[PDB]
Design a protein around this ligand. Structure first.
Ligand SMILES: Cc1cc2nc3c(=O)[nH]c(=O)nc-3n(C[C@H](O)[C@H](O)[C@H](O)COP(=O)(O)OP(=O)(O)OC[C@H]3O[C@@H](n4cnc5c(N)ncnc54)[C@H](O)[C@@H]3O)c2cc1C
Ligand SMILES: Cc1cc2nc3c(=O)[nH]c(=O)nc-3n(C[C@H](O)[C@H](O)[C@H](O)COP(=O)(O)OP(=O)(O)OC[C@H]3O[C@@H](n4cnc5c(N)ncnc54)[C@H](O)[C@@H]3O)c2cc1C
Ligand SMILES: N[C@@H](CCC(=O)N[C@@H](CS)C(=O)NCC(=O)NCCCCNCCCNC(=O)CNC(=O)[C@H](CS)NC(=O)CC[C@H](N)C(=O)O)C(=O)O
Ligand SMILES: N[C@@H](CCC(=O)N[C@@H](CS)C(=O)NCC(=O)NCCCCNCCCNC(=O)CNC(=O)[C@H](CS)NC(=O)CC[C@H](N)C(=O)O)C(=O)O
Lengths: 486, 483
């Protein structure tokens, strides 16, 4: 009918590409997708493929895999492997080179995708709303920039994702974000990662494996302990294991200002009065939805706390305008953005409405060692349930008894609704935790009870079999009070 | 005098003896031929898994896996003088002996500190349905060290390697000796397509000297019979790619020790090859003879003791669990049967072991994880079967250099209702991934339960949540595809 496109997707990331693909393919709709760059890298960092591909999950997993070899090389000795350890060295530029080729290939893959799909078209530029049914494509983020294209459409989808949050403190311009970290030419000998979240924790491990001769990695966090939002036992254990591998963790510390010393070094003064020197300061304190450049007021789309407000079906307060992924500020993860996009396309161009359950979402932290988690943490469950039970198990994995890494304790924790045995959450710390948690993610979707876990025969020998060996709770939570059996 | 007498202090035996004395306060006597691992009897207090099974082989597979990491590290910028690389078989053996020895001790410690639990060193045999004798040897004419009268007897003698009757079999070893070799063989021949043969081939392949070679031969057409055909084909390609030599439809006829101390092996086809070590891993059989079972009249069916779903034999007060029953020879299963037996005998609730949908792994390089039925079976028990396949080179293997390491995930379902009949995996961490899905099958999950779960990204396991369209089906045993 009138309006050239059926759907206009602003942002070619995880959710955008999924949305765009389904509508053109499954429903035969003419879709236009817009993004700022064709390939990864400065100046805009993300490009076709989104954050996960260009400056997220893909590159960090390869870099984390590389860091892990430091562990492998050191531990091989416990099993009789010999070599002249004095010739060992990590070549950072090689890592960056292979990472760049891996991402570039994905960028190309998405490009040919458009070239081979009828009804799917890509537009290079910055998209913004002129009105609720007209999207402009400009040369730059500036709203007074030249208009390259003007797309009339029947439906609009906002999938601009997020961007790192730089705190307004003196000297912030001497700091970088995770964005620049992917393109460093050399690894910093002295680096400070500001933040207690997963990005900060993951990069600290990367920097720890590739740091030069007299290097030191320092992580600092404002609060009491790292990984706020995760199970307290795992937060405590990971802190010990990271420290044991040479990472200095400064909690209860908060920068006041960053000064650039004449020798190119940065001096950081904390509110405590403590002053330290680093070669690189990286801010990984949070990510914010990118709503700014969209010009949402031209359509009257409502923004709640930072992100675009949407209902359960990803619909905004304005008809024919939807938003998915990180810009909605729900659960900032790739698999969730993809699930929302596919559900949204079904609700809009399909027969049956559909929505994404944002509960019992399994996720991981690729720290060294890594974390896997699904469900509620006891602190939250105990406030929602009158009777909660906590099953805990800590042991040294077989290989680490002889590998030398005595400190690598594997922690398994299952929390349940004691009134009926329903498993509310599973939290793991230890090697392969991210691979083990996927399968249990399905179990919670099936509303499994603790009895269901221990009535399954285990695979011997593996770390995973321990989840099927927890029959008795360690302590309980009765109306928020911690209690035990005498 | 004792409430229960357990013949065999292994995975199942110790499990029964423990909670019977604990949970039911019964006086238990446990018998075993050796207290520490190694020659002469190899197995000892703790059983096969602990002494010459799961525990020691797992440490050795971890050791062999480092050949992969050392090589693959180069792809991520790790460099070192690769010409100075050498593997030390004796350090590997030294550390595993330590680890095993500490576990043997841990069990001895257990008996002293547990009231009503007593260990008797030696060989146990039935004198009568209520009398058990502990002699100094497997030969029933040896000195009776102890005589015990009990109202309950539990048989858990386990299994033992099956050495074929061929000329020269005295120049061959079994998996038992493998754990104690002083130096790694230059040329080794592993006979058998089973898991023990495949796992050891990967261990020998990693610790082989300078100009070494590992050969695996199997009578059949393809290794790992009983496993999913795709995994069998794919694993073969990957073992071969790593330098392992696989000879299918070959079987040794005779083994002649020759001059220099090597062995000349002549296969049934006429092929003749020399090896420095020949390991026979063709089978495991229940140890029932030394029990003098006819002294009580307990039935034997096919090598193993005949028992019902509740592990009771034909004689009222005698039960049998574990490998000796020839059901499913795995440690977790034996442990489950033990606890269920103890309940059915000293408890209010009769309880039995579900031998179906048990997950298991093969610690080969790369490993295998599996749970449920294979399509060859499912299409015979079901009229409409759907097969979902996913093959892909993981992210890290694109960059590590090991581009041949293809990850395979296969899901088999009963297409009439979507119920998942089996999940088979090949690839790094397959053993860890399969455990969680093992629970899913006990909960009777359907394929929709898998693809409706949000994945963990990036991981190999999320691929199981992205399979939603069948590759092909099986209609009344016939393979069919949608047009
Ligand atoms: C360092 C890091 C590590 C991460 N690791 C993980 C992990 O391992 N697992 C996981 O699940 N998630 C991880 N994430 C998060 C994951 O990347 C995001 O949740 C996911 O990318 C969100 O998908 P999306 O569709 O919302 O947005 P995106 O993929 O971010 O796509 C948004 C797109 O919008 C484009 N754009 C922005 N504004 C405009 C405009 N006005 N006009 C045109 N184009 C525009 C951007 O260039 C970008 O390509 C990580 C994130 C970071 C940064
Ligand atoms: C090389 C190898 C690798 C394996 N790997 C795995 C694996 O990774 N995972 C897995 O689940 N399973 C594995 N298994 C199988 C597993 O070890 C057995 O299934 C398990 O040990 C069986 O427990 P059980 O109690 O039935 O026997 P056992 O552990 O075999 O205990 C039997 C005990 O009886 C004793 N004995 C025998 N006869 C007498 C007698 N008359 N008097 C006194 N003592 C006697 C023996 O000395 C032995 O200690 C492996 C086995 C082998 C050989
Ligand atoms: N929940 C996702 C899981 C896989 C995933 O994250 N896929 C991303 C790719 S990064 C994706 O497809 N996002 C949306 C999208 O692109 N939709 C359009 C449909 C076509 C899909 N892509 C076509 C182009 C082909 N290349 C890629 O998609 C490149 N992707 C990858 O390389 C991703 C990393 S983001 N692989 C995986 O995450 C696989 C896991 C890996 N094998 C491991 O072992 O770790 C899903 O269900 O698809
Ligand atoms: N989960 C499987 C069974 C796993 C298993 O084989 N467990 C063995 C432990 S060796 C066992 O307990 N067998 C029976 C038994 O021992 N019964 C007697 C009563 C309880 C006390 N037994 C333990 C004595 C102390 N020493 C050890 O337990 C030393 N064990 C280990 O080191 C074992 C290997 S057999 N680790 C595990 O079994 C756990 C896995 C390992 N941590 C990993 O990293 O993968 C199942 O039942 O489904």
């Amino acid at each position: 009918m009138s309006k050239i496109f059926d759907l206009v997707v602003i942002g070619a990331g995880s959710g955008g590409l999924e949305a765009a693909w389904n509508a053109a393919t499954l429903y035969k709709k003419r879709v236009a997708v817009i993004d700022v760059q064709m390939v990864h890298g400065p100046p805009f960092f993300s490009a076709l493929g989104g954050t996960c591909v260009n400056v997220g999950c893909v590159p960090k997993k390869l870099m984390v895999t590389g860091a892990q070899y430091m562990e492998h090389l050191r531990e091989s000795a416990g099993f009789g492997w010999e070599f002249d350890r004095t010739t060992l060295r990590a070549e950072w530029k090689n890592l960056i080179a292979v990472k760049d080729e891996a991402v570039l290939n994905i960028n190309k893959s998405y490009d040919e995708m458009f070239r081979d799909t009828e009804g799917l078209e890509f537009f290079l530029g910055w998209g913004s709303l002129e009105s609720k049914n007209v999207v402009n494509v400009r040369e730059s983020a500036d709203p007074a920039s030249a208009v390259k294209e003007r797309l009339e459409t029947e439906h609009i989808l906002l999938a601009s994702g997020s961007w790192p949050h730089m705190p307004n403190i003196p000297g912030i311009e001497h700091c970088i974000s995770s964005n620049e970290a992917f393109y460093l030419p050399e690894p910093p000998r002295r680096v400070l990662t500001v933040g207690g979240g997963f990005i900060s924790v993951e990069f600290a491990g990367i920097f720890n494996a590739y740091k030069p001769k007299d290097g030191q990695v320092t992580l600092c966090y404002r609060g009491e302990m790292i990984l706020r939002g995760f199970d307290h036992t795992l937060r405590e254990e990971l802190t010990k294991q990271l420290t044991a591998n040479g990472i200095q963790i400064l909690t209860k510390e908060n920068p006041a200002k960053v000064e650039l010393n004449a020798d190119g070094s940065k001096s950081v003064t904390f509110e405590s009065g403590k002053k330290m020197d680093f070669d690189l300061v990286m801010m990984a304190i949070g990510r914010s939805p990118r709503t700014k450049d969209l010009q949402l007021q031209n359509a009257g789309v409502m923004i709640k706390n930072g992100g675009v407000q949407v209902d359960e079906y990803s619909r905004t307060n304005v008809s024919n305008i939807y938003a998915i992924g990180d810009v909605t500020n729900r659960v900032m993860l790739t698999p969730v953005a993809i699930n929302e996009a596919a559900a949204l396309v079904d609700t809009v161009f399909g027969t049956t409405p559909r929505k994404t359950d944002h509960t019992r979402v399994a996720s991981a932290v690729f720290s060294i060692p890594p974390i896997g988690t699904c469900g509620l943490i006891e602190e939250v469950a105990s406030k929602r349930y009158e009777v909660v039970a906590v099953y805990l198990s800590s042991f040294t994995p077989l290989m680490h008894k002889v590998s030398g890494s005595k400190y690598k304790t594997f922690v398994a924790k299952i929390i349940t609704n004691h009134s009926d045995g329903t498993v509310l959450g599973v939290h793991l710390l230890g090697d392969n935790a991210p691979e083990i948690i996927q399968g249990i993610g399905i179990c919670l979707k099936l509303n499994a009870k603790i009895s269901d876990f221990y009535n399954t025969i285990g695979v011997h020998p593996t770390s995973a079999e321990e989840l099927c060996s927890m029959r008795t709770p360690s302590y309980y939570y009765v109306k928020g009070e911690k209690m035990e059996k005498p």
